[PDB]
Amino acid sequence: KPFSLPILTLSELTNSRFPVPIDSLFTAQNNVLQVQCQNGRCTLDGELQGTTQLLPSGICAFRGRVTAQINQRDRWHMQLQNLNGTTYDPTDDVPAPLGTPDFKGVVFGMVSQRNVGNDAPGSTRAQQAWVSTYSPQFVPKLGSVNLRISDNDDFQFQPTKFTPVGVNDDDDGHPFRQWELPNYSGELTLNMNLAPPVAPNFPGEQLLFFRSFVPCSGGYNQGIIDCLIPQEWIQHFYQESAPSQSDVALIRYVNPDTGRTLFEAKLHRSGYITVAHSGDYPLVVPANGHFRFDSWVNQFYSLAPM
Amino acid sequence: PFSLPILTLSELTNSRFPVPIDSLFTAQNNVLQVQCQNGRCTLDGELQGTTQLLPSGICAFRGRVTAQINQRDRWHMQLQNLNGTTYDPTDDVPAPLGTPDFKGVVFGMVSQRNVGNDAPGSTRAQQAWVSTYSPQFVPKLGSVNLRISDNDDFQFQPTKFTPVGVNDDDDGHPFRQWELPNYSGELTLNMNLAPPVAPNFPGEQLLFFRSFVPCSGGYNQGIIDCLIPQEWIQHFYQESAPSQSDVALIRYVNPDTGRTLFEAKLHRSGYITVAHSGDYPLVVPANGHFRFDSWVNQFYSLAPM
Numbered sequence: 160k161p162f163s164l165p166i167l168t169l170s171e172l173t174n175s176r177f178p179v180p181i182d183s184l185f186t187a188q189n190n191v192l193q194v195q196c197q198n199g200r201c202t203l204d205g206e207l208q209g210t211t212q213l214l215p216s217g218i219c220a221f222r223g224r225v226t227a228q229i230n231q232r233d234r235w236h237m238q239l240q241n242l243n244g245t246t247y248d249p250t251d252d253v254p255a256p257l258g259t260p261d262f263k264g265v266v267f268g269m270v271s272q273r274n275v276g277n278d279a280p281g282s283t284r285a286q287q288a289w290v291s292t293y294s295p296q297f298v299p300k301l302g303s304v305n306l307r308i309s310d311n312d313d314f315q316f317q318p319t320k321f322t323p324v325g326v327n328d329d330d331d332g333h334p335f336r337q338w339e340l341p342n343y344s345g346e347l348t349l350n351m352n353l354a355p356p357v358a359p360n361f362p363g364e365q366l367l368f369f370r371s372f373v374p375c376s377g378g379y380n381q382g383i384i385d386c387l388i389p390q391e392w393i394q395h396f397y398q399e400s401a402p403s404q405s406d407v408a409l410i411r412y413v414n415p416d417t418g419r420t421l422f423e424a425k426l427h428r429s430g431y432i433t434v435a436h437s438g439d440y441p442l443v444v445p446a447n448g449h450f451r452f453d454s455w456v457n458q459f460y461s462l463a464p465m
Numbered sequence: 466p467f468s469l470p471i472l473t474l475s476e477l478t479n480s481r482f483p484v485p486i487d488s489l490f491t492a493q494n495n496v497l498q499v500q501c502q503n504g505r506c507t508l509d510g511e512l513q514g515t516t517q518l519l520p521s522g523i524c525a526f527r528g529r530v531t532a533q534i535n536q537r538d539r540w541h542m543q544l545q546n547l548n549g550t551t552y553d554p555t556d557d558v559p560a561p562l563g564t565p566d567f568k569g570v571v572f573g574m575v576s577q578r579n580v581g582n583d584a585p586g587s588t589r590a591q592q593a594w595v596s597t598y599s600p601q602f603v604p605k606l607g608s609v610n611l612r613i614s615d616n617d618d619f620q621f622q623p624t625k626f627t628p629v630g631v632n633d634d635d636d637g638h639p640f641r642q643w644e645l646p647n648y649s650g651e652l653t654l655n656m657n658l659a660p661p662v663a664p665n666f667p668g669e670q671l672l673f674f675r676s677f678v679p680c681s682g683g684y685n686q687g688i689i690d691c692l693i694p695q696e697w698i699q700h701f702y703q704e705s706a707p708s709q710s711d712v713a714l715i716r717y718v719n720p721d722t723g724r725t726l727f728e729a730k731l732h733r734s735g736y737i738t739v740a741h742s743g744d745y746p747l748v749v750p751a752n753g754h755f756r757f758d759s760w761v762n763q764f765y766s767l768a769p770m
């Protein structure tokens with residue numbers, strides 16, 4: 160019934176857009192470029208949106224069966240299941256199977272197989288793999304993605320899991336763009352059932368992000384993945400399902416030792432945070448700090464500058 | 466009031482390896498001691514052993530590679546706490562939090578991102594393995610050694626190990642989920658361990674949340690059993706509800722039909738027992754989950770599961 164947040168420091172939080180811990184808080188200058196991530200989307204009354212599911216280990220993961228190979232760089236055709244192993248239904252009201260990556264780039268990690276049926280049941284293998292979300296075969300909404308793997312001679316048409324490790328630019332100039340959605344149904348097709356874009360409306364306000372610097376596999380990319388709210392908050396809201404009393408929950412970032420409030424922010428009903436600030440700024444805050452719910456306010460509440 | 470999160474098996478994460486729970490399993494009582502160090506937490510929210518809060522910290526390492534040796538476990542990784550803070554070997558823990566708690570090989574990837582003067586911001590990643598049998602697996606002392614696939618592209622720089630799965634080693638060191646590694650040297654006892662767990666009521670057995678994790682070759686089933694799932698640990702940590710007795714009676718319910726399917730003892734120190742005899746993979750509806758019933762005590766007589 161009453162709304163609340165879990166009590167967790169930054170290093171006790173997991174990025175909802177990639178399965179790594181949160182490193183820092185960041186507020187971004189408002190730009191023409193649209194924020195419309197599909198992972199890490201959840202209302203304050205606990206409605207998961209976009210491709211959001213509950214498990215950190217589901218974020219940017221795939222599960223399915225490899226069924227074919229093609230003579231293209233994205234060689235191995237992986238027919239997808241839901242992450243829990245149930246049959247994926249392409250007519251479901253989602254942009255893609257839950258956990259699908261929500262950015263343009265290459266996700267690198269490992270694939271693992273475990274055979275079932277007649278052909279060496281129980282036999283296993285694992286190796287490095289990449290998934291390009293630029294690929295014309297990246298069609299997860301339709302029910303498949305194609306994989307690039309390091310050893311084409313040790314891979315079978317068997318149950319397969321992709322475990323993500325990090326991200327990068329592709330090596331042919333297709334850059335890692337965290338705010339550009341992939342085409343979940345491929346070239347010439349438009350995305351559907353998307354979680355809506357988010358932006359501050361109030362003047363002087365900017366989005367606040369929970370920022371992670373994820374692993375990269377070569378070159379100098381910083382590996383920045385920003386999420387709106389951390390996975391643990393999504394998990395908490397899902398459990399609680401506290402009805403939202405207004406469009407905005409006022410929240411305070413507190414220092415629990417000294418008891419002082421360091422700044423305040425607007426946590427919007429649809430599950431994102433704004434602050435009163437101008438310019439890009441990595442926040443300077445004590446390590447023990449965390450947000451607490453203060454009160455229900457509205458869109459036009461005037462935040463103390465941060 | 467004490468409570469459990471409301472989560473189906475496929476909405477739960479193994480607290481001993483970063484994968485979802487596949488099933489429930491009760492095991493015949495054996496001479497072999499159950500004393501896992503990850504996935505350990507009291508019902509009042511006290512994390513124990515090497516347990517920390519993040520699924521992505523389980524069997525992960527963070528640190529700096531500082532040297533290489535002419536051994537199979539070639540690359541010496543000096544460890545930090547998973548949040549990047551300095552590891553203190555005199556801390557009252559068995560090892561840095563998240564360290565693997567079994568004998569075997571963990572396979573995954575290492576990634577580096579340079580800092581300081583030498584090409585700061587440059588990165589690289591590749592396949593790597595950590596053997597917990599290794600004489601250089603001394604995480605309590607502050608280091609582990611890594612085997613990697615490409616010895617020519619690896620620097621003395623900040624390094625993260627991301628686990629993907631487990632296996633037997635290739636040479637007579639099998640994956641043994643219930644054998645603790647030596648967190649310090651070969652002749653040094655482990656310390657600050659979370660205690661062993663066993664049923665002590667007659668007719669009772671441990672109940673496990675079971676996952677079949679990825680393996681990298683051969684036929685190993687990849688079984689990792691945890692006492693309580695990561696989400697319960699996270700929940701107890703938040704709640705810190707005072708425990709009113711040594712045992713919380715819990716019921717596995719079907720939420721659609723409202724029926725209770727069986728009951729179990731959730732002990733204060735954070736493990737579950739059931740009245741059953743023999744190894745048994747439970748067969749239970751997919752929508753099912755545990756709910757807290759009431760505080761009881763050690764002598765409570767469970768309905769047979």
Ligand SMILES: CC(=O)N[C@H]1[C@@H](O[C@H]2[C@@H](O)[C@@H](CO)O[C@H](O)[C@@H]2O[C@@H]2O[C@@H](C)[C@@H](O)[C@@H](O)[C@@H]2O)O[C@H](CO)[C@H](O)[C@@H]1O
Nearest residue numbers: 330376377378379584586587588589590615617618619620
């Ligand atoms: C295919 C190949 O030659 N791999 C080498 C190579 O990798 C380079 C190379 O791909 C260039 C191309 O523009 O981009 C990088 O420099 C890449 O190296 C990676 O990124 C640099 C900054 C380093 O961090 C490096 O360790 C990393 O691998 O050269 C490197 C050696 O520098 C490796 O030897 C690759 O195997």
Ligand SMILES: CC(=O)N[C@H]1[C@@H](O[C@H]2[C@@H](O)[C@@H](CO)O[C@H](O)[C@@H]2O[C@@H]2O[C@@H](C)[C@@H](O)[C@@H](O)[C@@H]2O)O[C@H](CO)[C@H](O)[C@@H]1O
Nearest residue numbers: 279281282283284285310312313314315635681682683684
């Ligand atoms: C050629 C090479 O160096 N490695 C192959 C090799 O890998 C085998 C091998 O290490 C044997 C040891 O005698 O143990 C395994 O069988 C291993 O293969 C792995 O496990 C089997 C059951 C298969 O599932 C297999 O796909 C998996 O790689 O053989 C395999 C091919 O059979 C690979 O080609 C390796 O690269």
